[model samples]
Target: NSAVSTEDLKECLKKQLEFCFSRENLSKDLYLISQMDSDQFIPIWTVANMEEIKKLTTDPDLILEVLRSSPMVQVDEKGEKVRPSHKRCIVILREIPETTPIEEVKGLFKSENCPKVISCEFAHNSNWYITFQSDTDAQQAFKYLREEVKTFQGKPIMARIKAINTFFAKNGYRLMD
Candidate 1:
């Protein structure tokens, strides 16, 4: 005497609408996506990690699209609207002779808890410029610096910049690209 069908199209449509528009469901989905993107989001260019930079370099078109939507921050000073902060970048270079074995270079990085390392070579010069980034601790910026230095002991190495620069943006204030 069962009149109800096992599959009802009408019931399915009603359930789908409810689930799609539910506040709780929508919020949960947003939270998950935000978390995934947060790990990859670069609030500011200078502070972004190597992984983020690599992604940007790989997707030039996406970067260009985002740039069109991005806005620069302006501050009112002396009744004038001017950019309070300008974008800045630091390039750290280590000169390793051509004779240095590639294994030695890799060994230096393997000794530390570095999150990422990117290396490039140019035909003009035989020097290798290795840029490293560590995500071990945001609070401890130099957490892996000393360890990495020790790994490459007794080599002609120079840290172009002794200190790293960070930005402290005010709450609800816009930051660099």
Candidate 2:
């Protein structure tokens, strides 16, 4: 709701940690929570989402309790942090740069009032696979990816479907979530 000092990266996260924790905003904290580096192992604020995660719960207290004892990436016994990243209806976005905030990714698709887009931090500055609510939303966002405006930096973000997916081939796998 206000401007935060972006003195440095981790510094901003600390600020965000305080801010989001105040409102239970779990979305922005994935970077901290997923990597399992949070000092308290528990968040401070009261608000955030990634949707796969955002949709996973309505109980904030349980999240914190499980989060504390969670990951080495940490494991979720009852499933808060472990929501599966699905394959279908996703657009692969590349060259978005490591410096861009995940929120900005959402910003790019803002006109659609996007339902829930997950920005994966997998390969660092490499790419993201965004899951959308519908083919309409996914295609709509794909439309924005290459508009004449040059959205990210001065270059168009390389967004496409199943392009990044074929690269992984996490294929033919059955595993427990």
Candidate 3:
């Protein structure tokens, strides 16, 4: 695990806060703001490694709390009822490397228990790119693919696009038409 210094952690938090607060649209911003209530915001100094973060935060409990206090409930202008807002969060982790031409990353599409396989095809460049459709199932199918194929992790390439798309979909965020 890498050591994220206090300064680095603070910088990361500052950048994230800037990005979140500088959203271009109010509707989008409100949606994000509502989803991330004050308590959900972690302080800079509290930042820690993944394992420690998991231990300290106890994701299971946090998830339960988030679900308990869902943003789905709201009232419309005319006192009409509206569904809860989507819970959108994109969790991008570093990818693990593979040493073979056919090393497979499992468990991405395991939810359905089908034979759906999203394989990574080598690209012209030194890195590889895995392409798939925009469908939820298709995207989910590639989940394991991304985990196994380290090329998509932290790389500035199209391979990361599916994960982004999946994140948006999962969190109820939509792209502008």
Best by lDDT: 2
Instruction: Order the candidate numbers by TM-score, best to worst.
Output: 2, 1, 3
Per-model TM values vs. the true structure = 0.29, 0.34, 0.23
Q: 129 in model 1: Cα distance from truth in Å? A: 2.8
Error of 3 at 153 (Å): 16
Report the lDDT tens digits of candidate 1 across residue range 1-177: 345662343344334334422434423544322432233232232212224344334543333333322233222222212221222122232565566676765544432333435543332244344444422221122344344544465775532322233357444546332
Least well predicted 10-residue stretch by lDDT in candidate 1: 79-88
Predicted candidate 3 versus true structure: per-residue lDDT over 43-99, tens digit per residue: 222322223233334443232222222233332323212222322222222233444
Clashes of 2: 17
Candidate 2, residues 1-177: lDDT per residue as tens digits?
345532343233334334433213433556544643233232222222423335444555544453433112222344433321222456666777777787666565543444655443334336666666665456555666556225655666665553212344444547311
Candidates' C-alpha lDDT: 0.36, 0.46, 0.35
Of 2 and 3, the candidate ranking higher by TM-score: 2
In terms of TM-score, which candidate is stronger, 1 or 3? 1
